[PDB]
């Protein structure tokens, strides 16, 4: 159960992992002349951006409740990817994602990781409300789930993780392409996806065409004084493309 990974300039491994299911079996690819909408020959940064980038350390505990991100927004700051995104009205990209989560032989607990589509998050508050841009687009900073006092609550998404933050049951979440970090089974987990939309390419900053969720399905523990472990995620964009070049987006 060993893998190595190589994209654009950068490489990844686990020597205790079971291979990704490729999302729907479709290995990532560029747009087709048969399906395209945009007229130009689009921007292929290739190796300089279909390469890995990784998020700030989250860390977790038995008390922890969940984390997620929305893409491409979660990668808006990833140099070439980030600006090439911000300077175009449109683009498209798939992703290779690996989540890094080693423990000792002496830990238990499990996370589910789900790649998830439009994942249209429900409000925290009841009634005539909807989610505000700052929170739907948390950037690489992401959304960890917490017990208390998130301001502007009327525009906040719900914290209700076991309702998938949208009023659907968890545990059926395995309907999406998914994996488990299980500390016995593996030390890491991986998933890869092509581009997807109802449209052949999309307004990157305006719509998170993919999203990624990680949930503490089983509580972290060990008897060791190292009561907590970080998690980090690395992503490479795939076949990344951009079209309608103009100024940098604000």
């Amino acid at each position: 159960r060993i893998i190595q990974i190589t994209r654009g300039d950068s490489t990844i491994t686990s020597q205790d992992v079971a291979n990704a299911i490729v999302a729907y079996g479709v290995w990532p690819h560029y747009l087709s002349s048969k399906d395209a909408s945009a007229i130009d020959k689009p921007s292929q940064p290739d190796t300089s951006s279909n390469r890995f980038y990784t998020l700030r350390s989250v860390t977790w505990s038995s008390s922890s409740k969940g984390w997620w991100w929305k893409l491409p927004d979660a990668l808006k700051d990833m140099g070439i990817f980030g600006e090439n995104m911000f300077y175009h009205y449109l683009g498209r990209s798939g992703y290779t994602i690996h989540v890094q989560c080693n423990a000792s032989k002496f830990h238990q607990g499990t996370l589910i990781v789900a790649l998830i589509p439009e994942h249209q998050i429900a409000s925290a508050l009841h009634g005539n409300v909807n989610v505000g841009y700052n929170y739907t687009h948390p950037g690489e900073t992401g959304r960890e789930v917490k017990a208390e006092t998130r301001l502007n609550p009327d525009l906040q998404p719900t914290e209700e993780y076991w309702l998938n933050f949208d009023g659907t049951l968890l545990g059926n979440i395995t309907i999406f392409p998914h994996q488990f970090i299980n500390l016995r089974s593996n030390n890491s987990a991986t998933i890869i996806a092509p581009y997807v939309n109802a449209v052949p390419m999309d307004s990157m900053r305006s719509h998170n065409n993919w999203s990624l969720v990680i949930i503490p399905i089983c509580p972290l523990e060990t008897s060791s004084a190292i009561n907590t472990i970080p998690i980090t995620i690395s992503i490479s964009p795939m076949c990344a493309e951009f079209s309608g070049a103009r100024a940098k987006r604000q």
């Binding site: 999302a23 087709s32 607990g109 016995r184 089983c218």
Partner: protein, 237 residues
């Protein structure tokens, strides 16, 4: 005009009819189907997906992940029962699984079900466990040996993560009704085949997660507007 004469069943609308109809919007043309990933043709591919049972459906766990999970006690020298469930696809809790909901959208079901189980405890830890099924017409078992007379599997918790096993289709009729009223399909039942053994100063605890899906054998009939969900009043906007 041609001499014609009109049969009953004319002039009704049936929400489940089948016919040609004239266009509201002639000369229009739809957008092309780009090759979006995630094709689908039937509900059975959804049935093939393993989904978690909220096995542990009680107050102390319901509003949380923990109703998908059970906790095991390495402290116990006993053969005894860990848990049990029905097997009727639209019974609680199974109905809440996606196969459950799809079955709840239906009136008839057939074919054997896949069940799967991960030893979510500490990697250093060992056990072997009994997962068993009860052919009905009989009470849910009260000794491990009772379940050993049923069809069952003993889990060699090797390096590999998961045991997976099947309730065989043993309905008298080729189908069964998806929801029982005053009726039964049989039981899942779970037991300590050995005691669970952690090595010293490991957490005095373990977790188990449980999965189900339709086997290649599985099928449904009589699609019906599902039991599982209710609308009260108007849906606001």
């Amino acid at each position: 005009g041609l001499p014609v004469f009109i049969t009953p069943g004319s002039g009704q609308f049936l929400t489940t009819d089948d016919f040609q109809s004239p266009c509201a919007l002639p000369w229009y043309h739809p957008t092309k189907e780009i090759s979006i990933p995630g094709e689908v043709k039937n509900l059975v591919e959804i049935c093939q997906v393993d989904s978690l049972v909220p096995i542990n459906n009680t107050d102390t766990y319901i509003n949380s992940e923990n109703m998908y999970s059970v906790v095991l006690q390495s402290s116990i020298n006993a053969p005894d029962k860990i848990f049990s469930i029905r097997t009727d696809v639209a019974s609680q809790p199974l109905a809440t699984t996606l196969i459950g909901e799809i079955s709840s959208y239906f009136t008839h079901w057939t074919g054997s079900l896949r069940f799967s189980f991960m030893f979510c405890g500490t990697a250093n830890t060992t056990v072997k466990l009994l997962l068993a099924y009860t052919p009905p017409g009989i009470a849910e078992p009260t000794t491990r040996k009772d379940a050993m007379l049923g069809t069952h599997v003993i889990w060699d918790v090797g390096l590999q993560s998961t045991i997976s096993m099947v309730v065989p289709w043993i309905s008298a009729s080729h189908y069964r009704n998806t929801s029982p009223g005053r009726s039964t399909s049989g039981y899942i039942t779970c037991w300590y085949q050995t005691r669970l053994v952690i090595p010293p100063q490991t957490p005095p605890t373990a977790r188990l997660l449980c999965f189900v899906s339709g086997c290649k054998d599985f099928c449904l009939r009589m699609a019906r507007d599902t039991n599982l969900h209710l609308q009260s009043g108007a849906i606001a906007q």
